[PDB]
Design a protein around this ligand. Structure first.
Ligand code: CA
Lengths: 94, 94
């Protein structure tokens, strides 16, 4: 598939979450596209900070969402992932 | 290989900074080795969060260091870099 379309559709997902000032937990991209997606969000008008938490949990965080709260959320996500919960059942923001 | 030495030597510096809850702005890694260094820190027992805003300025943030403060610092660093200051003269933590 084209990367432009992948980035465009994931931008639409990000926008839906960012409209509520929620972070977008998304690990679908390979390297270095994972980091580049943050440049895409910012270029397209969606102010975003990229974090990788707990070693391997990436997230795109809108302005207006507390980064320390996202890190706290990642700690809980890690415990729940280890217990076998799928990504869509993990907490988005504590 | 030289990458193994690179990661091992920078681990030592990160450990020293993290002991004082200071972030490590380290620009010696070529993307995507920048993100991989954060994975290495975590794999070696140094709890670290990787943060990227809008320029090349890799940062590795320990537990107990405020990520919102690091984000604000990244913004100030970018503005000062744009004005001509060298990396060594930039703030590490507002
Ligand atoms: Ca904070």
């Amino acid at each position: 598939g084209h990367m432009d379309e992948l980035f465009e559709e994931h931008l639409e997902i990000a926008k839906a979450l960012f409209a509520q000032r929620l972070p977008y937990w998304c690990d679908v991209f390979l390297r270095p596209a994972d980091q580049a997606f943050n440049a895409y969000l910012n270029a397209r008008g969606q102010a975003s900070t990229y974090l990788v938490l707990e070693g391997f949990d990436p997230v795109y965080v809108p302005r207006g969402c507390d980064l320390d709260a996202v890190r706290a959320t990642a700690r809980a996500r890690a415990r729940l992932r280890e217990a076998g919960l799928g990504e869509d059942a993990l907490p988005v923001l504590l």
